[PDB]
Fold this sequence. Notes:
about 50% helix; four-stranded antiparallel beta sheet; Potassium/sodium hyperpolarization-activated cyclic nucleotide-gated channel 4 (chains A, B, C, D); Helix Hairpins
Amino acid sequence: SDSSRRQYQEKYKQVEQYMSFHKLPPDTRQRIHDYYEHRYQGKMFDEESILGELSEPLREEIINFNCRKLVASMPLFANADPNFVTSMLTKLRFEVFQPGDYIIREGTIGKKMYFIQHGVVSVLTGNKETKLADGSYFGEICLLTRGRRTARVRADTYCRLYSLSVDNFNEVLEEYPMMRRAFETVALDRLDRIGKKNS
Amino acid sequence: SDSSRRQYQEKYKQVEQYMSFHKLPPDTRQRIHDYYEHRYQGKMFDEESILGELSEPLREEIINFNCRKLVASMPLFANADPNFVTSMLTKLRFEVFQPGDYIIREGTIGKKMYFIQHGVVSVLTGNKETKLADGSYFGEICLLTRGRRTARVRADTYCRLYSLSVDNFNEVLEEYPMMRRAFETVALDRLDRIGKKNS
Amino acid sequence: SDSSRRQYQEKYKQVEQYMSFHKLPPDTRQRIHDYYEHRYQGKMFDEESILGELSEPLREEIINFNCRKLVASMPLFANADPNFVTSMLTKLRFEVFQPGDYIIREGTIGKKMYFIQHGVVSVLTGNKETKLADGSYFGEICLLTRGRRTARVRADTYCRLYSLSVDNFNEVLEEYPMMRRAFETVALDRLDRIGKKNS
Amino acid sequence: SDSSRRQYQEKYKQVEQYMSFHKLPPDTRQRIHDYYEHRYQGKMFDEESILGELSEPLREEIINFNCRKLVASMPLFANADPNFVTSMLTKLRFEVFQPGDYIIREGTIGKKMYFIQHGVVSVLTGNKETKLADGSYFGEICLLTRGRRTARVRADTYCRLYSLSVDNFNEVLEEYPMMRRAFETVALDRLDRIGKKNS
Ligand SMILES: Nc1ncnc2c1ncn2[C@@H]1O[C@@H]2COP(=O)(O)O[C@H]2[C@H]1O
Ligand SMILES: Nc1ncnc2c1ncn2[C@@H]1O[C@@H]2COP(=O)(O)O[C@H]2[C@H]1O
Ligand SMILES: Nc1ncnc2c1ncn2[C@@H]1O[C@@H]2COP(=O)(O)O[C@H]2[C@H]1O
Ligand SMILES: Nc1ncnc2c1ncn2[C@@H]1O[C@@H]2COP(=O)(O)O[C@H]2[C@H]1O
């Protein structure tokens, strides 16, 4: 049924006047148009408000239902205690990225990581371009090491991701330490496909 | 009179489209329906906004009036200095739970506790299932010990609870230290109905 | 002109249904009615939003204009550098209190102080009841000492006050240290009208 | 197109009643009128909300487009790595100031700095009045030194500025340390046009 469509139309209308007030380039206006399309597919809800009204058991049932493909396609999540998984899902924040974008720049102090729900990113360490898709993640190396982004990451398609901050990362992993090593293992393989490591 | 009914109808309508957009299972949609029913009984107010407009003396008169049964049915509150009580009420946050739910999982790092206003929960330490109802609380052991949930707690009925975080717990108890021992006593009896203690 | 009257009528209407939903006593409902009357005199504005849109130079011109009587009637403010004054005004938060109320309870850990704009409070240390009115303040002793409220303070009339937290208090006084001693002097006179002091 | 004009008209209407309720002087009411004129030029958008809906890559494309003249006219920004620049833009907060105003007072503990986008400020250290315009900044000395404003800064025209807090300043400069010295160099020249320095 249509009604949260109008808040979208109503909001995006506001965006349109915002763009026009700032006399933005056309490529920008287009890009902004298409992003909204991809991020909201036409409706808009107070998801934050809706969620807040609910209880934890429900919110978890929702995020869990919504990330069934995320969870099944990702070994680290799929072969994990669904309680650790839940607690991690519950902290991801959804984000959309368009082709060309820079999700992560090299040299930058990294304070978050990403779970590719859907799309293809390009990783360029520079050495060779390694590629990652649905069921993968990246940017965990700054969360472990608290240093600089050991490469660049660039979206090739309309990515749909989930972000996790170092805060939440370290929280979930203090509660479920066994799982720190999973992320550790992966990070090393990658540091050794570069030529580095931490201590 | 009817008018805050509409914000409820208006909000829940939004929930309905939110659920449908996410193509949620029917058991979930039902569960979500019934929760709202139990948490809002049909109206919705900016209680947070209303409260903020008021002063402390009033807000306290309200929460106090509203928790008359909570306070009378609970020795620890009832035989306590109503000033300590007030200051504790004023920090509880209301929460509803449905049958089956997991209020508390074992092994999890605990950062809050609960005051059963109304309903029956099941405690499973696993050893025997101990039961708790109106006029009881639980989950105080992680607040005292800052370790892991020493059992599991599962709602049997539509519970109506009040939650207290460790922050607020420790604040109220620094102002009124005599009362730390009450919660202490209870926690031990329970640790000794298990087989543990802290230091 | 009338339009922010309606938000008041609209809000208070909500309060009315809130009160009725919670089946509050009549004395309470009356008290709540009269408070609103005294705190909003019938209109309601997004003062926080309005203010945020403004700049610092304006907000200060406003609070300054609005506290002309507060500032003139209070030696400590009136004989002070209007720059220190401004910076203090800018941090007060307006509060209304009704007759009978307990602004401050003895024994309680104190985290804020008050500037009587208008009304009469009663101070009971217990020894004798000392009285304070417009152009006075109180509750500065816990801000200096970080201990317990050295008395009780009870409104006799519909008080209109401004509150200052210890945070802001200590901030404004680190920028303008000369002024710490003013509040210090006053606090001692009062501790010696009791029988105490700090160190 | 007109629609965010109404929120402006609707908001400013509220301001008008706010001013009248507080019986503000006419010079103030005028001043407040003209400020709004200069800060919103007639429309109002949820820029914060709009921005939040967007992604980082877009927000940056916007702020970057909007600060083209800011960036080109300011050596420190223009001859800098546009990545450091971006990350700094992204943290500025827009502010408008009217003639006469005190942007910065001497002796005050300084917790932020300014980038003159457009307008002329007057600096009075007191020694001689030095002047600064578009493509300049000031108030960086307290950010480096964490002491007191080494002068006074007063707007001569309707200034349009961008503010940067010490927090964000020190964050951006920990990520891009080479750039600390730029701001350092400038600060010294200025301390030596006074007669001071830090250690
Ligand atoms: N060889 C690789 N294969 C896959 N992913 C990589 C490789 N090298 C780096 N990454 C990811 O790219 C990210 C770049 O930023 P981070 O250092 O935060 O974390 C890095 C890894 O998560
Ligand atoms: N034998 C028991 N009887 C009643 N309550 C208990 C018992 N054992 C544990 N609990 C409660 O169950 C809670 C489980 O989580 P906590 O460790 O936070 O705190 C525990 C107690 O509050
Ligand atoms: N003799 C007195 N005369 C006036 N005010 C007092 C006197 N004694 C205490 N007070 C005020 O009453 C306040 C009670 O709380 P505080 O200790 O925070 O600070 C105290 C003083 O500000
Ligand atoms: N001689 C000068 N020329 C230009 N700007 C100055 C001069 N002296 C001081 N300033 C600026 O004026 C500011 C006053 O506050 P700050 O100490 O924060 O930082 C100071 C400088 O940024």
